[PDB]
Amino acid sequence: DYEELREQLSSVSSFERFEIFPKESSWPNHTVTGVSASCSHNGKSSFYRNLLWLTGKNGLYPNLSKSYVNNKEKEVLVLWGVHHPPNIGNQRALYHTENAYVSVVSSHYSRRFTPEIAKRPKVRDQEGRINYYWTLLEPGDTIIFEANGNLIAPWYAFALSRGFGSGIIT
């Protein structure tokens, strides 16, 4: 729904980036690692600024369960990714399981995702892919966020202040 997101962001006049789950204290049993080679910064391997690619720590990826309550007057845009490895061995390598899934629920929606492991033509040196997903969380709403692997968690999700006449041009 990229095209839909571009439309949702077209009416945003401003936003507040929030740390939602920003630190090792939000994720004591998960770490941020995985393939960073293709999202480099000034020549150094790296990861997206607003997303945390979580892998297991010390061999484990505990069932992940986190939630966010939108205790703000503004809507919050939450982005997530789901990892889709090129091979089964690359899922196991991140301590994600074969039966990994991502489940995202709010009072108004539910979506469940599973990995689709496949060899892809190589793009930007990668044979795998990450799909990106999102929702707009209404004030007072709560997202219950769960995973059994392949989760790229939100960071700098943001509050939207709406207006009009604005949009995206190239």
Partner: protein
């Protein structure tokens, strides 16, 4: 003629859209606003021109 020219509105009443159908909502809205501005324009212009022509 002015009366006969309008097509009785046996058309869609309105439509609802989902959360992830914002582009479809906006397309529908654009279509309604477009047609509304076109018909407001045509209706008022027809009346202004016909009124000027009638008085003339």
């Amino acid at each position: 003629s002015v009366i006969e020219k309008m097509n009785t509105q046996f058309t869609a009443v309105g439509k609802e859209f989902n959360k992830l159908e914002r582009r479809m909502e906006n397309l529908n809205k654009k279509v309604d606003d477009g047609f509304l501005d076109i018909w407001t324009y045509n209706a008022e212009l027809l009346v202004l021109l016909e009124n000027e022509r009638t008085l003339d």
